[PDB]
Amino acid sequence: VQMEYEKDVKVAALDGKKIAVIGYGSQGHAHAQNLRDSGRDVIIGVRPGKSFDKAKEDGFDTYTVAEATKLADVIMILAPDEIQQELYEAEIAPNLEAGNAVGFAHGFNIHFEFIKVPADVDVFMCAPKGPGHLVRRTYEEGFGVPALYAVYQDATGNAKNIAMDWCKGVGAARVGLLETTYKEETEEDLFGSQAVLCGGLTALIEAGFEVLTEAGYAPELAYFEVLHEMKLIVDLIYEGGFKKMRQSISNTAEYGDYVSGPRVITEQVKENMKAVLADIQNGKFANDFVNDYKAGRPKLTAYREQAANLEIEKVGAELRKAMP
Amino acid sequence: VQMEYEKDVKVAALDGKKIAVIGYGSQGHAHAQNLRDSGRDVIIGVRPGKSFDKAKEDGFDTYTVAEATKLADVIMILAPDEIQQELYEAEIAPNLEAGNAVGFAHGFNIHFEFIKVPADVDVFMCAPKGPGHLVRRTYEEGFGVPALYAVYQDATGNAKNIAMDWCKGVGAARVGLLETTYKEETEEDLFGSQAVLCGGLTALIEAGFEVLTEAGYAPELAYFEVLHEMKLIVDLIYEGGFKKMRQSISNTAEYGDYVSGPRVITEQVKENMKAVLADIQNGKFANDFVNDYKAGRPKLTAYREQAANLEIEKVGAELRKAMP
């Protein structure tokens, strides 16, 4: 797969389309504001509330969800995964016309088929690899955030052109686009955050903090040596890979990296990751998350209250308070 | 332990002292430049070549390592940890006088006793928690990098004041100091970089990238999902702990974090970290590193060449160039 830019957006497929952005959170706000500043015809749809009147005061023709769908050719759904199915069956599905295009920024509900869009309506994705405030701010400052695009079903023959023009309209094509599939995006994103970015990382940090503090070392120092200093290390990898990071650190730290990394993250850890991937591919994780949500989030409640009691979080808060 | 600041530096002990910074690399330049801008009397001792002229031209009275030591009351050793022992014996030790103070930014050589400073000379440490250009840049912008300080041997009764005033002179006291010991700094810094920051983290990223690419997923997407998007996550943890990071990601990603984190980083992984720590405490790692240096760095050679051939490193460089 090769990275694509503005020159690769062959058809200005959003020309003359009425675009509804569903939801006005950080993500919904950025997409809608960026498309408007690019020259597209964006209205907002959301339930009545703070979002509604923040949109109405941002200048957007704001309607309910059910009725902004009625008005639009392109309906981009930027609500949380857990409410999308209800919001779609109740407000969005009864207001789609043949030839509309429905967009998502994450493939979870379409891929796992919690939502099924009629076969005469396009389904596309444009999935910026950054948070809402960054998608909006980088656009305001003249570049953007790179993004994935995908098409799950193409009824009109325009679905890919719509996805790429969407990415171009929100600034993503200024910095780079990668074509994917709903299946690949959904499974790789879930595996990445579960096994490495979020789950693996916090568990690695926490286990290191436990080893140090259980061995008798000062927890304030431990906080610096397993968490605080990670920002600069990761900044370096972000900018220049493992190579740049390992030049900046001491030779002692770099030698320890080579020698000790493999002792911590072993072949067995890789096998553990494979089982995590399996439960993503076979729908078990997805069903587990949806079931927890339908039951009132009991597992999420217990996890959150356990995390709030971690010693690294209490020590950390105090130290971050002491370092303005 | 409690965080200390410029108000806690009770005595300006570098007053009237002539200071030699040994080495003029990343840490060397930052320490020497910050202290110079703080008004201290700083000369540079380094072997003829690069660093020599650079200090000549940045205005430093610049002599050789033996010469600068002879001239100085305070001698800060910022050469690579693996050459410090040979360099100290040949060039530094014969030029010390009773009442001098010898400093380090990492406790490796003093703690594991590859260097032993005479009993009528102080030994202190200022260990900033960042690389030099950051220690320098934060200083030039009016704050600094937080630092640890410690004293291994206090011959004059002034060693702690010298250590703390050094921290102040390089800007660390603007943001926060933590007192520690040579033993705790050395062992916790080695463990953190090996088990979590550098070794653990790169091995985790690499295992995730392998799982994905071996299962048939696109490596350009794998690069974003296990590496590029980590910066946002770690920035969040840096600013507000696990709590702020888990508030900011989706409930889907947050749930996956709680559920899959412990599947990947298991009790066995924690045991692996304990064995890593044991070899730091028992001096096995330290002798391994020093021995590899003496043999011509054959292990470091093979490790560096292997790292240069990693698929994630080649894909990453191509992607980072496609994203200016």
Any overview of this molecule?
Chain A is an alpha/beta fold and 324 residues long. The first copy, chain A, has two domains: 1-180, no CATH class; 181-324, no CATH class. The first copy, chain A, is built from 16 helices and eight strands. Chain A has helices at residues 26-38, 50-58, 65-71, 81-92, 108-111, 132-140, 159-169, 182-197, 199-214, 219-228, 230-248, 251-264, 267-281, 284-294, 298-308, 311-321, and strands at 18-22, 41-45, 62-63, 74-77, 101-104, 122-128, 147-153, 177-179. An eight-stranded mixed β-sheet of chain A has the order 3-2-1-4-5-6-7-8, sandwiched between helices. The two termini of chain A are 44 Å apart. Chains A and B meet through helix 8, helix 9, helix 10, helix 11 and helix 12 of A and helix 8, helix 9, helix 10, helix 11 and helix 12 of B. Chains A, B: The active site is at residue 106. Chains A, B: One of its GO terms (cellular component) is cytosol. Chains A, B: Belongs to the ketol-acid reductoisomerase family.
How is the quaternary structure best described? homodimer
| Count of individual beta strands of chain A | 8
Specify the number of helices of chain A. 16
Query: Structural class from helices and strands of chain A?
Result: alpha/beta
Query: What overall geometry of chain A do the principal axes of the alpha carbons give?
Result: globular
Using only CA atoms, what is the Rg of chain A?
A: 22 Å
Q: In angstroms, what separates the terminal alpha carbons of chain A?
A: 44 Å
Q: How are helices and strands ordered from N to C of chain A? A: EHEHEHEHEHEHEHEHHHHHHHHH
β content of chain A, as a range?
A: 5-15%
Greatest interface (CB-CB under 8 A), with counts per chain: A-B, 120 and 119 residues
- Main sheet makeup of chain A: 8 strands, mixed
Q: Portion of residues in helices of chain A?
A: 55-70%
Number of domains of chain A: 2
Lateral arrangement of strands in the main beta sheet of chain A: 3-2-1-4-5-6-7-8
